Design an enzyme around this catalytic site. Structure first.
Site, PDB file in Angstrom:
ATOM      1  N   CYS E  45       0.839  -1.533  -0.132  1.00  0.00           N
ATOM      2  CA  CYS E  45       0.661   0.420  -0.081  1.00  0.00           C
ATOM      3  C   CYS E  45       0.617   1.200   0.171  1.00  0.00           C
ATOM      4  CB  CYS E  45      -0.910  -0.299   1.541  1.00  0.00           C
ATOM      5  SG  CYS E  45      -2.719  -1.200   0.793  1.00  0.00           S
ATOM      6  N   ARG E 117      -9.512  -4.141  -1.483  1.00  0.00           N
ATOM      7  CA  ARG E 117      -7.937  -3.860  -2.319  1.00  0.00           C
ATOM      8  C   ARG E 117      -8.536  -3.047  -3.342  1.00  0.00           C
ATOM      9  NH1 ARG E 117      -3.282  -2.914  -2.558  1.00  0.00           N
ATOM     10  NH2 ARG E 117      -3.084  -3.783  -4.043  1.00  0.00           N
TER      11      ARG E 117
END
EC number: 1.11.1.24
Lengths: 237, 236, 238, 237, 234, 236, 236, 235
Positions: E45, E117
């Site tokens: 991330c 996600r």
């Protein structure tokens, strides 16, 4: 199943005096009523009870209390049963009896074989159920106790008093009547500071506000209950 | 709400004498019991009824009947209320009282503010409800009538008889006891032909099978109910 | 099913040994906080010791604009007798109402209830009728009533100063009697707070100052001092 | 939502010390545990509470009580938060913190917004919830009172005694402890005739079974709660 | 929520403040790309945040705003951004939705939090135009997101469909596809007009995109394929 | 179906015959990419078919099979492929699922049929690893699908996470990420070891991918970026 | 599932001629229509039927009957299939075909693998279903019988007559048409007394009200059906 | 409502020949059956159909097909109606008619005023519904087409072939029969490489496997349909 303090359920019933609305018919007249129930017509315990009530009819009337029976049989059977009683016992039955084939009324009152159809409901002039008695079919009621109950309740209402066990022969306070107890600390304190009542504690105050005539009347019901009849209706039949 | 002739609801209850199972605790002793209910502790009409039952405790004993109270308050309050009665009225309350905070027992018996918690259940030694009385919170019971009820039911059971209104002072048949009525034409016929009983009709036959002792015992309950007390406990 | 912190106290009419009242309205209408404290039954020893502690601290609660109300699963008659006993035998008059809850209807509504042992919740309720704190000490363990005073004191101080209150206040080991600025919730707010240089800080999210008066701080400490001190003369002896 | 007296709900949870099963992880060790909850990481009131708990870790350890936190943030945030505390406050946080993003655990405990995720559960070695404390997000806990609670409960459990208000400084009986009251008439009478205990009534009997050491320890927690710290950790920083 | 459907109306708390989606962007005439993450202080991330931040101007050029989502509090979000600016030297300019409880992720059908996600590309009418679901163990190709938005905007304005691998399609290169006829008469009229290059009535194309638009899209891919001169970790 | 979930069990009819998913591919140790299409004889989908066909050997080399899905019949499918081979000169080597009724599209959450455009990348355990949803007006970037499968396989094999834009990540280049520690003790042990290049305990990486595997991923992207020398329409 | 005499279910449908509402598109033109259904495009029995219908298109036109196919495949597939027919068989298919991917229309009509999508619905100018035929996928229709059905239904309607088995070649009454039977006793009596019709009984009266043109056109459909083609379309 | 390809619904029914179980009664005899339905007895169109079927009965028998009517009226009425037909038309009706008062059977078959009780179900010897025709009460059936349907289905089954429109007079392939089409690419390629069949495309191959006699029999049905009777039974 309707509880003490609840209004008698509203219903139209067919009696051997005609169709009436309960409790309205009586409420309209400012009358209390005692409704007493029976499994069937031409039954011996119920017959003794009908005769007991009939012999006490004037005492009930003087108190402003009407009587009304209920039996799970037809209006025609009811009238024939009453004829039998007048003919054979020599006592006319003055009060109406509800015809309850189908057991609809018995069922509405929570009383329903019909053996359990035995409740007694004592209902005041506001239409409220004040006392209920359930003597089984094998056991006759003590009708003088029903007179004591109505008398005591009426005194209680009119005097704003609760009535002790076994009144007017209560073992603690005799013909005394109980002040409804305080429900707050300040009220209890004030009652005690007033010295207004005889008292065992702030929650147990009492006085003697009933008239001698009211006490003597209630006592007479109990004395009558305890007294063996000098002559029996079987004898003069 | 449990009706005459139904078994007393099976329940475990906490009393100020301990935990017991109803009706089993009494059934297993061959005892009847009278369960009497009250809205709250430290209330006057209920106190007067506790004292009346207490004073008649021997008479219930004599009949093989136990007594048990029920009040919507804790066991600690129950014990304190009884101490008060013994100290201030001078009468020891010998019977247990069910502690029913939450009103679980009262609710199970259909008695339930707690003003309606007033039923009396008279329960035989087979655990069957035989009579129920609902005097309201403002009106004390006539405890001598409860004795008459138990005495008359036991006699009726013993002698296979029904009991007339106002017994043993019934206005038709006095201390007579009623033969349960025939339910068939043939049975009615045979009963009338037998000449076995005094009768007003085939459905109204009676006799006098109760002993003088049993009759006088029942009448004594009523005589006592009618007598003005010689001395009052409040004075004493 | 208990009501949580920040939820309004459930609306209900209740019977107390002072008379019938509506909650929270009876207190909201007066601009008062209340502490409702619950008990399994009357004539019980831990509860009696708690009643007496509350009664001793009655003036302290009053000074903070906080009323006290008990709840016990017994009748009003039993409640009045219980209070009589306490005044006679301990020599302390219990000044506050106690809700009579036979049937346990109130206890049940509050999520506190077969046996009544769990009927022990304390609910601290502000003058908007909002539940601010709840404590659940069991039947076998008496409350520390001086901590209930610290709770209400700190909560009122935080409300009026727009501050959070650190652990163990006014004796917090990091910032002492300091009170915490409610943290920023945006980057621009975090940077502006840091650039202003206006607060003592350990990070943008941990800034503090000392806005409480000496007297408010000392009052809070006084509660804890009292809690820590051995009583001069016990009530059972005297 | 789970009540006093109930078993702490069985659950697998992820902490920054690894995955554990509650209450089993602690019950297996014969340890009590205090689970304390927090709305979010990097929050100032919770940081002060962690530091208070850490400073008292040896006190909890001596009593056989483990500490476990809960905060609605990830295990990664938890570890970074603890790093920040060690670095800036200079106090290492030694206890695990449950990572509860999604609020699954807080919800299971009836704590869940997230402002309401503030419950403290004090759980014994049998896995039973013994006390619950709900201080709101804007109000720090008094950690010394949590120590008094656990000490008092353990003493009560071991001496078969109830603990009065404000113990060991109760205003009526001081450091005395309460005999669980009689629940029958005969038990109450037997207790009174026995002369075994000090008493104000049959339901209020007490004795002084606590050791001087045990009393002194509980007092020590209160004295510490009351004492102004000698040095502030913000200054030491 | 599927492609072609409006982005679910919701109020969300970000580290920049509370905003209404999709309204906040729609009212500005802006597209937005919403990109989701399982947790703060996670390495894949973090690399994605840095890639978006480095491409911030390119999204600005296209009138596209960026917004992250992570299952962690606003306080954790701000610390995470601070860490990236301090240790990588890149400031993260876009808001991140704080989604503790995972209420927002659940609303978007994304919910352990490993499944959080999703990428949603939303146009200026508030309509979901593309969705990408790269797993937590696999970083996105951020230059492809630029190509997607550039291509969608070009398709919208020119009334054209975009071939595979555009602007390097192997059949038609930088050609754009005419949306096919849906009736026989329309198909016949198109073939007779001689208006378009075609392989059949259902496959007609032309080259309406400017050189600038074509070269901009190819630049995104050229950047994706290029080995970095210098690494930020160095 | 979400990433990490097993691909839904189903029997499907393709223009190569009837097969069971994902079992058909699982049992061969094959990944598969299933890519969906609204209708046959459609231009964007035709361009994607040709792109996939041209890259068929690249997928095969990776151990990845291809399978289309379009809401039309098996007869229509075969005719469409014939048209492509005859008119574009490219034979379509992979099966296409015939899905009239849209039963399969519906099972996959993809359903007018405009929304039938999902790409599912499924591993050899039958698990969905990536899903892409390019709308019907926007052709996919097929070289990115190769990059995705290559990178997932590498990550699986090397037990590593893959950074954004790999193998050209701007922080760590062709570096791969060590799955981060989930306990304090583990994070401490990792940092103490000094085994990895590190920005923090949760951001450690190394370079375990081969020159060959890095070069392969980089050429997929170089191919994406490169304009073809000759266009198939020119041929033709 | 929708029965004869019931209105054709209201629906919007996409055809390869455009989007239309049924039955309104035809009703609003005063046209009958024959809707004929097919499992899939590029199927041989259905192709033979399309060609038979297209060859008879003028005969349907003469009767004011429009034709519309239905097949579970996309518009793009439909247009390609039609192109194939015109190219390879040399017959232009003039009628629209509903595109029913996902089988919505087929399910609404109670027709729905897709093998059962084979219904023929003959619908009049008021949108009422007048006849339904269900020949299975393995058996081609007799299209001239469909012409006979529509002609006979329209004749019946205009003459207020029922049409006997095998008309105009019925073995009892030949080209006779049947008078709707009486439904009351008085009406049956009146009919017999009028002596107006040829009759076998009051419920079986008939006459010959059809023109020679109507009769010979109906018979021509059957003669065509029975005739071996002079040249087969396969041969060129 | 039961669809083509589905088993004919299991049911016991009362006919004017007695009580029987469908489709078992026919399946047990290795017979196909044609069930044809009627709104009521003593109705003119239905009478004409009964007569046409009766005249064609031997043609059905020779195909191993039996006939069964259904009408919403009682067995007594059924027998009276059949007597009337034999007396006034001179044709004996040889097949059973189901008595369906209450309309239970029509309702089970999704056919149900009783105007809609007109379905024809052609059922094979496995008990599977193969074709269904729904001519309304105002339009008599073409019974020779029902013979063509059964002849063609039986040929198709036997020869493993599909049957073109208008067979044996199809305008593209005449009396040719269609090879069921390939369902895979490999099968399609194999079929074309074989060169085994006349073909227009891989999905449209055919041959001429039907005997001369079978072709001529089917064409005989259509010729009979087209031909005007030389004498009418009314005469």
């Amino acid at each position: 199943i309707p509880l003490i303090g609840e209004r008698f359920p509203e219903m139209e019933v067919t009696t051997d005096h005609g169709v009436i609305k309960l409790p309205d018919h009586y409420v309209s007249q400012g009358k209390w009523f005692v409704l007493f129930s029976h499994p069937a017509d031409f039954t011996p315990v119920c017959t003794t009870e009908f005769v007991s009530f009939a012999r006490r009819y004037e005492d009930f009337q003087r108190l402003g209390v009407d009587l009304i029976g209920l039996s799970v049989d037809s209006v025609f059977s009811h009238i024939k049963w009453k004829e039998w009683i007048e003919r054979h016992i020599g006592v006319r039955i003055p009060f109406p009896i509800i015809a309850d084939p189908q057991g609809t009324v018995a069922r509405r009152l929570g009383l329903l074989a019909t053996h359990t159809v035995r409740g007694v409901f004592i209902v005041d002039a506001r239409g409220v159920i004040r006392t209920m008695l359930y003597y089984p079919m094998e056991l006759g009621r003590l009708v003088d106790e029903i007179l004591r109950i109505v008398k005591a309740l009426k005194l209680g209402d009119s005097l704003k008093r609760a009535v002790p066990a076994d009144w007017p022969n209560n073992e603690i306070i005799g013909e005394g009547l109980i002040v409804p107890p305080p429900t707050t600390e300040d009220q209890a304190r004030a009652r005690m500071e007033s010295g207004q009542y005889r008292s065992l504690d702030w929650w147990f105050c009492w006085d003697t506000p009933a008239s001698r005539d009211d006490v003597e009347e209630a006592r007479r019901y109990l004395r009558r209950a305890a007294e063996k009849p000098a002559k029996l209706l079987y004898e003069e039949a």
